[PDB]
Structure formats: C-alpha cells, structure tokens
Amino acid sequence: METFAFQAEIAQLMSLIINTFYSNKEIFLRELISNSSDALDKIRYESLTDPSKLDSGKELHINLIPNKQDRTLTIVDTGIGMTKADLINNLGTIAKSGTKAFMEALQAGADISMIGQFGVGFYSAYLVAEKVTVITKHNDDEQYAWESSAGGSFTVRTDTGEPMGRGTKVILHLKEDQTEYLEERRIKEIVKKHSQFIGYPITLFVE
Numbered sequence: 001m002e003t004f005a006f007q008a009e010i011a012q013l014m015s016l017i018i019n020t021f022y023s024n025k026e027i028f029l030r031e032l033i034s035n036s037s038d039a040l041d042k043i044r045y046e047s048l049t050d051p052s053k054l055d056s057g058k059e060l061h062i063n064l065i066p067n068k069q070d071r072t073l074t075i076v077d078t079g080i081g082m083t084k085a086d087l088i089n090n091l092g093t094i095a096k097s098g099t100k101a102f103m104e105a106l107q108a109g110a111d112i113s114m115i116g117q118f119g120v121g122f123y124s125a126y127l128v129a130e131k132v133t134v135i136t137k138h139n140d141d142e143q144y145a146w147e148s149s150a151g152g153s154f155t156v157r158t159d160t161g162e163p164m165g166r167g168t169k170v171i172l173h174l175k176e177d178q179t180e181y182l183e184e185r186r187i188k189e190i191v192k193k194h195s196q197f198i199g200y201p202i203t204l205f206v207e
C-alpha cells in the first residue's frame with residue numbers, strides 16, 4: 001500500500017465539505033450516480049468503434065448496495081473504470097482545477113449542491129462518509145483500491161478482492177449519524193427525486 005499527500009486545494013475542499021454546516025446532504029447520491037453514468041457513457045462510446053472494449057463485460061448498469069452491519073453504502077457501476085495513473089495523477093489534476101473553480105464560485109454565492117458542475121462531485125461523498133474506498137478496474141490496467149479518510153492523505157494498492165471485470169465501486173463508510181442512507185425507503189426517495197432519468201438501469205439492492 002502506497003500513501004500519497006493531497007495537494008493544498010483539494011485538501012481544503014475536503015475540510016470544507018466535512019466542517020461546513022449544510023443539511024442538504026442527500027445530493028451526494030445524485031453526484032455519484034452521475035459520475036457512474038458518465039463513466040458508462042465513456043466505455044459505451046468507445047465500444048462503438050471497438051466492440052472488444054466490452055469483452056470485460058457487456059452489461060452497462062449501476063447498483064446501489066446498502067449494508068447495515070458494515071454501515072456502508074456502495075455505488076457500483078460497470079463503466080470505464082480508472083487506471084493507476086487516473087487514480088494518482090490524472091484525477092489529481094482534475095481535482096485541483098475543479099476545486100479552484102468551485103471555491104471561487106462558493107465565495108461568490110454558489111451553493112455546495114452545485115459541486116458537480118465543477119467535476120469534483122465525487123467529494124460530496126464526504127458529506128455522509130468518514131472514509132471512502134474506491135475499487136476500480138479499467139481495461140488497460142489491473143484492479144486497484146484507492147482510499148481516504150481525509151486528514152491530508154490517500155492510499156492506493158492493488159486490490160485482491162473479488163475480480164470486477166470492469167468498472168468502479170465507491171464504498172461509503174457512513175458517519176454514525178448518517179445511517180438513514182442505508183434504508184430502502186430513503187434511497188428510493190433520493191433516486192426518484194434526483195436520478196430518475198439516468199440512461200442506465202439503477203438497481204437498489206435490499207437486505
């Protein structure tokens with residue numbers, strides 16, 4: 001397992017998301033589903049020119065999996081996934097520019113719910129999670145696990161868990177007072193409210 005330091009900009013955004021008082025936390029789900037949808041759009045478009053792109057899995061879907069025992073909510077997609085370079089370098093670049101733009105918008109009067117317009121909606125996960133674990137598999141690399149509980153660092157290591165084929169799993173280790181997002185009625189409510197028109201099947205698993 002390798003440990004990396006977040007750059008100042010993104011580290012500051014993570015602290016803002018965790019420290020700022022903001023009750024409309026439910027928007028985190030909309031943001032993660034949108035990220036999954038975007039990733040599914042990407043692998044699907046690539047498959048239009050090269051059908052073999054789907055040899056790692058033809059199914060294009062999004063699954064929402066709650067687990068009360070582990071107190072986790074996992075958003076699973078069979079999108080394009082992320083390579084090690086995406087995890088460490090490429091997305092670091094996006095996180096920096098996206099954070100700078102978002103911060104300037106906030107000081108102007110923008111709201112936290114608009115975070116997705118800046119390409120860093122993934123970080124809205126910290127509105128409800130104390131730790132986020134990302135398991136991902138891209139056609140051009142092996143399966144990896146990215147993880148962070150903030151505090152200025154994140155880790156990346158090869159993942160020996162169940163082979164995914166292709167895609168991304170965002171595991172939200174929920175804060176003690178955010179267990180409402182593990183309830184079927186709550187998740188169904190949020191999905192219908194903000195993600196009813198997503199162009200891929202969203203399956204809400206139950207326990």
Ligand SMILES: Nc1cc(C(=O)N[C@@H]2c3ccccc3-c3c(-c4nc5ccncc5[nH]4)cccc32)ccn1
Nearest residue numbers: 035039081087088091092095119120122134146168
């Ligand atoms: N293709 C995908 C991608 C996603 C997705 O949401 N992607 C995340 C994301 C979105 C925007 C900016 C950074 C990151 C990031 C980072 C990440 N943030 C960083 C900040 C600084 N340095 C490296 C960094 N890596 C690490 C893991 C996941 C993500 C979902 C499904 N399919």
